[PDB]
Enzyme design. Structure first.
Site, PDB file in Angstrom:
ATOM      1  N   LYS A   1       0.844  -1.229   0.000  1.00 29.18           N
ATOM      2  CA  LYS A   1       0.000   0.000   0.000  1.00 29.18           C
ATOM      3  C   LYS A   1       0.868   1.263   0.000  1.00 29.18           C
ATOM      4  CE  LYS A   1      -3.724  -1.116  -0.104  1.00 29.18           C
ATOM      5  NZ  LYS A   1      -3.576   0.156  -0.850  1.00 29.18           N
TER       6      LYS A   1
ATOM      7  N   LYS B   1       1.570  -8.652  -3.955  1.00 33.45           N
ATOM      8  CA  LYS B   1       1.393  -7.911  -5.185  1.00 33.45           C
ATOM      9  C   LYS B   1       2.334  -6.775  -5.365  1.00 33.45           C
ATOM     10  CE  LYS B   1      -1.632  -5.770  -6.446  1.00 33.45           C
ATOM     11  NZ  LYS B   1      -0.916  -5.023  -7.459  1.00 33.45           N
TER      12      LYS B   1
ATOM     13  N   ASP C   1       2.211  -2.659  -7.565  1.00 30.14           N
ATOM     14  CA  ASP C   1       1.328  -1.469  -7.702  1.00 30.14           C
ATOM     15  C   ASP C   1       1.153  -1.183  -9.194  1.00 30.14           C
ATOM     16  OD1 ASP C   1      -0.207   0.771  -7.415  1.00 30.14           O
ATOM     17  OD2 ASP C   1       1.362   2.006  -6.488  1.00 30.14           O
ATOM     18  N   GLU C   2      -0.090  -1.102  -9.669  1.00 31.20           N
ATOM     19  CA  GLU C   2      -0.356  -0.932 -11.122  1.00 31.20           C
ATOM     20  C   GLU C   2       0.398   0.277 -11.682  1.00 31.20           C
ATOM     21  OE1 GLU C   2      -2.915  -0.937  -8.773  1.00 31.20           O
ATOM     22  OE2 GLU C   2      -2.937   1.240  -8.487  1.00 31.20           O
TER      23      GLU C   2
ATOM     24  N   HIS D   1      -5.239  -7.610 -14.104  1.00 30.71           N
ATOM     25  CA  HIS D   1      -5.807  -6.487 -13.313  1.00 30.71           C
ATOM     26  C   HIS D   1      -6.681  -5.638 -14.241  1.00 30.71           C
ATOM     27  CE1 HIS D   1      -5.106  -2.357 -11.302  1.00 30.71           C
ATOM     28  NE2 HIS D   1      -6.121  -2.968 -10.683  1.00 30.71           N
TER      29      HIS D   1
ATOM     30  N   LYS E   1     -23.341  -5.661  -0.319  1.00 33.22           N
ATOM     31  CA  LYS E   1     -24.447  -5.538  -1.308  1.00 33.22           C
ATOM     32  C   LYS E   1     -25.763  -5.972  -0.654  1.00 33.22           C
ATOM     33  CE  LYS E   1     -22.659  -5.648  -5.576  1.00 33.22           C
ATOM     34  NZ  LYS E   1     -23.011  -4.587  -6.547  1.00 33.22           N
TER      35      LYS E   1
END
Ligand SMILES: O=C(O)[C@@](O)(COP(=O)(O)O)[C@H](O)[C@H](O)COP(=O)(O)O
Ligand SMILES: [Mg+2]
Ligand SMILES: [Mg+2]
Lengths: 73, 455, 118, 452, 227, 119
Positions: B164, B190, B192-193, B283, B323
């Site tokens: 993050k 992961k 970071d895009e 992604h 939801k």
């Protein structure tokens, strides 16, 4: 968790970090926590000498809606 | 004979009574025309300028024989509630598409009809692919079962985390954090895009340090660990170079962006990954510019089908716990469209056509976006043990550091799985099971003090 | 319907499909050119054939001609241009003649047309 | 209060953007702009995660304006540092600026309008392969707009028949021909035969009239290897131009092709497919003025710009503004046409605009007024729908353009006096008379949805 | 428009009042002209025969538009103490250089002006590179921080040594000395600029022996060493 | 030979004047590609000195214009033409278009006079 008409975390009030409770402003165990696993004198068993903690609602953002406080979908 | 002049569209492109064939492609748009035009003309006009039609009658058509090549509107249905909305249905012959190309199908079905001065809005909803056009594609490189066999992990969902807000960091500091998180007890990690190659950090040394960390973290625990490496670039020579280096270091998985990169590069990367034995993580970025508004754009359930045929192993799908009823039915439906093998028609779940996949592998869905320990049983009970759960600030926010942060998540997940395997209900009990497990793990405690209960 | 004759029907680019041009028409474009501050020039050549090469995209033969004298810099009247044309016509009576224009700000030509044929 | 710096002095190496926003009821405006800036750069207003020097990697809001005429609409300005982007990559830029801000639940809609690229960032790109002047010098054509035509019907014709039409069309007086965008390789016709027949027709037509001709060959494919294979054959045969779709193919593939075309001396023609899915509504998506700038940076020679009197939407002012941002070199700021920032292209070549989509002879005077003699006009059904044939149809289109060019140069109006120019020219032309009688009263007038 | 003949340089290449832009390259030479020529003419001549200019007026210039492409002298200052010394300042447009080439810039700025029979000496002192020409270069491969991270050495300057005059030495004797010095405690070890490949020692076996020595010296100390 | 002797402080100046290279060291080099006699035989020109010309202005002209001048210069009676030393590849003129236009001009000029030309 937002102030009237204002996307601001009501808890941290725009800060991200709150106060430690176990020590309640002290950084020193006030009892023997758990069971013989903590005594009443050393640093707080949580903040460990900081009196600080991340805000649960906003994970350090200060505001609500976002890729750190909201779900996904 | 040839008669120069202009005519109407509903005279050759509206076939009320028509029986579809098994080797056909079907679509379904919802439309809202301009004041003046009858619905029939609008529908016919849409199909006309997407197959074989112009605006003023040509002579070179009496030497090709239409009827064999032409799209046809064969049904129109009004929408309840709205005053100027209708659902149309068009059928397309099979000899109009090129085998193995998603670009051709996309440029044929939706190319220039979304911008006519006779409509005010359009939206594509569903597509039916015959089992004779799908057999010309390759599909996912490995699938679901093969990946599980490769990783040797059974019975429970996999875990992961993402680096993050931590940019402007040198490579060594990046590798240290990666090693700490991996040693904590997680499985994947992961990137970071928005991180490809920048003045503060180039890609080769970051690859080197991550590869160095993975082995040393793996040695101490005796389990297989990995990390996604971003391979998106500006040309096709850079992407191939990065993939080749990643293979040379002996890494197990890579990652790509397919909406802002393109379909052609994605297909090339999928072919290479199948050839050389790697896993692909997908992604979805910029998707919200298309599939958000309700009266214009393309629904996500079509892009999911497109991604399944082009090729991929993981895909993002978003959370579904927050939801309310009525909703989340669409999400449960288009997850089934991704994982299953035979899906029946169901209008209540937003399914318009019956779909058969004739033995194609599945895709693992991924959920993410602000989640903590108290959401474990709900996610376990909704998706099942066939997904990947990604944690963000719920791992790096622990008051004791990065390594103890993963232990809490691991313990909570194991406790939830054990509780499910005993007959206890994971929906009603919920908050109660976590508390009992917290009474023998100092790391689960402290975490249950920063993050409060549900209700 | 009628049929377009395919036999012995050459064309010479701009203003070749409109009816033949007259001297009034000629001394009307020269003025339009002058109003925008462009530089005239004349060119001549005895043939108009085009030749290509086996495998070189963007290469053609027969694009350059021969320059009469030098570009007429600092010219503010048309009459002068018309006199120079008659001199060229008298000099070589078996060649084509073309009229050009030039822009020094974008570095490019602006017009071109034929005024004499063999 | 932090991601909103109402005084920041924008530097000269920063990237600027302007959004229009529709907040939910209650949310104050100066609070939403800060959220947009944060959710675009880092995602926080606190310093709980830093202390690791940051700040030098965050975007900031520095201005806010209200939209006149609407009670709920605002304009926000954001500035980004230079060190956030990779040199020579449009994919990255698009991913970094727009890739998470369009799902924010505190807003109802969002639309990107304009962007300012500094010269310190533009110099790392290659740009168009050739440009405008070089192409005109190569083709040896000056003084008038160029002409072209697309082949119909789309899908259904063979290769021998496809080539028989190109010749008759090309022998009549046109300059170029094109393949439909949805024609790559199909069971009824494969590409390697179409290439050969088209080449033979081109040579035969060129030998006759005595001018240079060409045809745009489609090179879109499903994989990069096939796409690169289909261009080497065109290089071998000696053809001068190729075509590619850049929105359904990708930016990564377009950049690879532009490099190849610059290396081997070909011309590139671009088609804008699927663009209407992104820029048609006036409250959600990305305007075309941004995609046009991105393409000019990535590389290309031609680009579709749309008409204003055809079958597809389009407004005059807006168009007149982005045709200059595409052709000119230095552009000042004018909000009466949609320019929000000034732009300097430090000597980068221009791009030719193209107009096509349901047009005929009774439209020449206007098209010639809106665009100068620096464009290309296309006519598909207007040529293959003539009562006689393709050669008679092409001649009628060229005569109209020649008459219009001569009129203007003689110093006569075109808006006021246009029908006369056509009626007077039809007296000596037996082909132009027939066309005028067929399409006399056929126009397209509806209410614009993307007013401004 | 064309007037054949010769003219002065200070009539088109001396711009006393010019405001430089942020995309311009600037230089500064110190000059000492020959008896007879005024300083202004000298400075203008440098700028001319380094950008776009000859000696007798050409006609092909009325079709390109100068002013956009041309160097300009915009200041001259006398050097105190000296009697015939001055500092000049020239400005160069950005569209005159090729991206990513140092050879082109060097051959343009200093190519033929140091040999005119109207000067007696010249010297270049400084240059200002705009931030729009530098972004087209790559720069150092790694830098400072990355190298320190690679070597894992912090807090102190690094050490090294060079093989002194010990020529006519076989490869084995070279490797022995390298190993001894590396085991001593140093970090780096150099070679000799005048040693490429000679009859007394070829390069492949020297590479082999040095590589053999480096590992064996590295094993005993647990630190990264190089040569 | 020269890489350290020009910083000696005990001296004030130094200048190298001449060298002698023995034949035992010259035989290991290749030398000029063709020479003098071979070039004259290739070009078929004997009896007088050759002539040439450089193009001006330096920096500022396009590719079509550059080629239009080579032809007129070459068609007049010269033998060779040259590019300025600072002409490589610039935003105002790239190299691959210059090469093509120069080739076309050379062919057209050669077909007229009846002699071999170059650039
Ligand atoms: O496919 C077609 O319809 C056209 O060939 C026009 O054909 P006709 O002229 O024969 O109708 C063009 O591609 C469209 O104008 C594209 O629109 P845009 O320019 O907006 O991309
Ligand atoms: Mg088309
Ligand atoms: Mg020279």
């Amino acid at each position: 968790g937002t102030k009237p008409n204002s996307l601001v975390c009501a808890n941290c009030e725009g800060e991200g970090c709150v106060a430690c409770s176990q020590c309640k402003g002290g950084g020193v165990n006030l009892i023997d926590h758990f069971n013989g696993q903590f005594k009443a004198g050393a640093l707080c068993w949580l903040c460990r000498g900081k009196k600080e903690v991340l805000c649960g609602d906003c994970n350090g953002a200060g505001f609500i809606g976002g890729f750190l406080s909201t779900f996904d979908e | 004979g040839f008669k120069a002049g202009v005519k109407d569209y509903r005279l050759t492109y509206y076939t009320p009574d028509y029986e579809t064939k098994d080797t056909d492609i079907l679509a379904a748009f919802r439309m809202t025309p301009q004041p003046g035009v009858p619905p029939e003309e609008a529908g016919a006009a849409v199909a006309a300028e997407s197959s074989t039609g112009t605006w003023t009658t040509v002579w070179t058509d009496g030497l090709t024989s239409l009827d064999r090549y032409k799209g046809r509107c064969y049904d129109i249905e009004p929408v309840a509630g709205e005053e100027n909305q209708y659902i149309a249905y068009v059928a397309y012959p099979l000899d109009l598409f090129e085998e193995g190309s998603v670009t051709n199908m996309f440029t044929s079905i939706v190319g220039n009809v979304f911008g006519f001065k006779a409509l005010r809005a359009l939206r594509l909803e569903d597509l039916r692919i015959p089992p004779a056009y799908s057999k010309t594609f390759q599909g996912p490189p490995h699938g679901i079962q093969v990946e599980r066999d490769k990783l040797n992990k059974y019975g429970r969902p996999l875990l992961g985390c993402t680096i993050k807000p931590k940019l402007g960091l040198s490579a060594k500091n990046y590798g240290r954090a990666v090693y700490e998180c991996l040693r904590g007890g997680l499985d994947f990690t992961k990137d970071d895009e928005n991180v490809n190659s920048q003045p503060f950090m180039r890609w080769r040394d970051r690859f080197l340090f991550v590869a160095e960390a993975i082995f040393k973290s793996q040695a101490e625990t005796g389990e297989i660990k990995g990390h996604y490496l971003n391979a998106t670039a500006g040309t096709c020579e850079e992407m191939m170079k990065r993939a080749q280096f990643a293979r040379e270091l002996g890494m197990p998985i890579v990652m790509h962006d397919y909406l802002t990169g393109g379909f052609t590069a994605n297909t090339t990367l999928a072919h290479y990954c199948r050839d050389n034995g790697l896993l692909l993580h997908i992604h979805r970025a910029m998707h919200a510019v298309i599939d958000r508004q309700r009266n214009h754009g393309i629904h996500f359930r079509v892009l999911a089908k497109a991604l399944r045929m082009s090729g991929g192993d993981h895909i993002h799908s978003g959370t579904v716990v927050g939801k309310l009823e009525g909703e989340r039915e669409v999400t449960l439906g288009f997850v089934d469209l991704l994982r299953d093998d035979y899906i029946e028609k169901d209008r209540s779940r937003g399914i318009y056509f019956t779909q058969d996949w004739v033995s194609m592998p599945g895709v693992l869905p991924v959920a993410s976006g602000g989640i903590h320990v108290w959401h474990m049983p709900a996610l376990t009970e909704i998706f099942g043990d066939d997904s990947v759960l990604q944690f963000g600030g719920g791992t790096l926010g622990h008051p004791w550091g990065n390594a103890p942060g993963a232990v809490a998540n691991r313990v909570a997940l194991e406790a939830c799985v054990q509780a499910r395997n005993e007959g206890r209900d994971l929906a009603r009990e919920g908050n109660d099971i976590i508390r009992e497990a917290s009474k023998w793990s100092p790391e689960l405690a402290a975490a249950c003090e920063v993050w409060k209960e549900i209700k | 319907m009628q049929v377009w004759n395919p036999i012995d029907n050459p064309k010479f680019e701009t203003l070749s499909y409109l009816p033949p041009l007259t001297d009034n028409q000629i001394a009307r474009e020269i003025d339009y050119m002058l109003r925008n501050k462009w530089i005239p020039c004349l060119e001549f050549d005895p043939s108009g054939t085009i030749t290509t090469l086996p495998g070189q995209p963007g290469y053609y033969g027969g694009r350059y001609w021969t320059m009469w004298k030098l570009p007429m810099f600092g010219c503010n009247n048309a009459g002068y241009v018309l006199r120079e044309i008659e001199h060229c016509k008298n000099a070589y009576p078996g060649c084509f003649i073309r009229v050009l224009g030039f822009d020094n700000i974008r570095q490019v030509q602006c017009c071109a047309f034929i005024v004499h044929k063999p």
